[PDB]
């Protein structure tokens, strides 16, 4: 059988996902998370479906940009693997923590 070397498929996935624009998180699970978090603030809330979609677009755009920053931090440390300490450094320098 044929096997790609570690990192080859990963680079493939980078090109593919950088080329496209669809949401990468599943519609329903994300919806549940929204409803749960919101419910904890206020019971008996409804959501315009486009309110949920706006949250998803915002959330995914935040996370993709955080990973770019995180990646930069890993590479700064002369690694190619992102770690929680990379996310934390990004968020600290961003003024989020």
């Amino acid at each position: 059988p044929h096997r790609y070397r570690p990192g080859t498929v990963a680079l493939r996935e980078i090109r593919r996902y950088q080329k496209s624009t669809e949401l990468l998180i599943r519609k329903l699970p994300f919806q549940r998370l929204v409803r749960e978090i919101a419910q904890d603030f206020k019971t008996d809330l409804r959501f315009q479906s486009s309110a949920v979609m706006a949250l998803q677009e915002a959330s995914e755009a935040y996370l993709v940009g955080l990973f770019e920053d995180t990646n930069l931090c890993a590479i700064h440390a002369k690694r190619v693997t992102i770690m929680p300490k990379d996310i934390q450094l990004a968020r600290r320098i961003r003024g989020e923590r």
Partner: protein
């Protein structure tokens, strides 16, 4: 309504592969095993902050429905302006 469903642990609905895809879009080649829980936590904070402001706008308007506009205004306040949903 016959009853009402209990929402718990829905953060785990944000799967490892979905998180991997977002990293990929973010140009990430290699991912440590701990990233997934870290990201879940970071996403949870993000959503809490935005939903809290969105819901505050909803309540101020005396509605029970969170509108796209509530979310857009919430996003704007937090310096994360979104285009494509009405503002």
């Amino acid at each position: 309504k016959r009853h009402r469903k209990v929402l718990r642990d829905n953060i785990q609905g944000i799967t490892k592969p979905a998180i991997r895809r977002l990293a990929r879009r973010g140009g990430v080649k290699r991912i440590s095993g701990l990233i997934y829980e870290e990201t879940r936590g970071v996403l949870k904070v993000f959503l809490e902050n935005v939903i809290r402001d969105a819901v505050t706008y909803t309540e101020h308007a005396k509605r029970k429905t969170v509108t796209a506009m509530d979310v857009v205004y919430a996003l704007k306040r937090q310096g994360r302006t979104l285009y494509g949903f009405g503002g």
